[PDB]
C-alpha cells in the first residue's frame, strides 16, 4: 500500500495489544 | 563487546536461514539489537554468515 501498512501496524496495535 | 566477526556468538541470534531473530523473541534491550543487526548484515555481506539458506 506504501501508506496503509504503517497504519495497520499502528492501528492493530489497538487490535493486538490487549 | 559486540562486533561483526565473533561468528560463534551469532548463530544464537539468527535462525537456520539467517533471518535475524526479533527482539521480542530474545529481549536484548533495543540497542544491542541494533548492533547485532548491523553485525549480522555486514557478516552476511562479507559471507561469514548467509543472507538466506539458498543464498
Amino acid at each position: 500500500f506504501y501508506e496503509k501498512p504503517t497504519t495497520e501496524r499502528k492501528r492493530a496495535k489497538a487490535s493486538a495489544v490487549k | 563487546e559486540i562486533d561483526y566477526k565473533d561468528i560463534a556468538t551469532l548463530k544464537n541470534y539468527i535462525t537456520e536461514s539467517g533471518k535475524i531473530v526479533p527482539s521480542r523473541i530474545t529481549g536484548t534491550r533495543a540497542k544491542y539489537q541494533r548492533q547485532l543487526a548491523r553485525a549480522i548484515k555486514r557478516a552476511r555481506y562479507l559471507s561469514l554468515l548467509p543472507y538466506t539458506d539458498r543464498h
Binding site: - | 562486533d3 566477526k5 565473533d6 539467517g18 555486514r42 552476511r44 555481506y45 562479507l46 559471507s47 561469514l48 554468515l49 548467509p50 543472507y51 543464498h55
Partner: protein
C-alpha cells in the same frame, strides 16, 4: 589518521600472491605514517555461500590507523584489481584492541 579496521578477500587459488598483497599494501600504507597494528590472517576458509565460482575464499585483515586519504586510493587499487574479491574498509568504531 582515524582508525580503519579493514577486511579483504582474494580468490582462494592464488594465496601465493597474498604475500604480494602484503608487500604492496602494508608498504604503501606505512609510507604515510601508517601502522598495521593488529594484523591476522585466518587464511583459507569456506564461505556461507558461493561467490561467482567457488564456495571457498581467503580472508585476511589489515586493520590500520591510517590517514583517510590513502585508504581510499587503496580501495581504488582494489576496484580495478582482479585478484581481490571484496573489501570492507570500516571506521574506527572507537578504536579498540585485538578482536580474534
Amino acid at each position: 589518521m582515524r582508525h580503519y579496521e579493514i577486511v579483504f578477500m582474494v580468490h582462494p587459488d592464488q594465496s601465493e600472491q597474498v604475500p604480494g598483497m602484503i608487500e604492496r599494501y602494508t608498504a604503501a600504507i606505512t609510507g604515510a605514517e601508517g601502522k598495521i597494528h593488529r594484523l591476522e590472517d585466518w587464511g583459507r576458509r569456506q564461505l556461507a555461500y558461493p561467490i561467482n565460482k567457488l564456495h571457498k575464499a581467503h580472508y585476511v585483515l589489515m586493520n590500520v590507523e591510517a590517514p583517510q586519504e590513502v585508504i581510499d586510493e587503496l580501495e581504488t587499487t582494489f576496484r580495478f584489481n582482479d585478484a581481490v574479491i571484496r573489501s570492507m574498509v570500516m571506521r574506527t568504531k572507537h578504536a579498540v584492541t585485538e578482536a580474534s
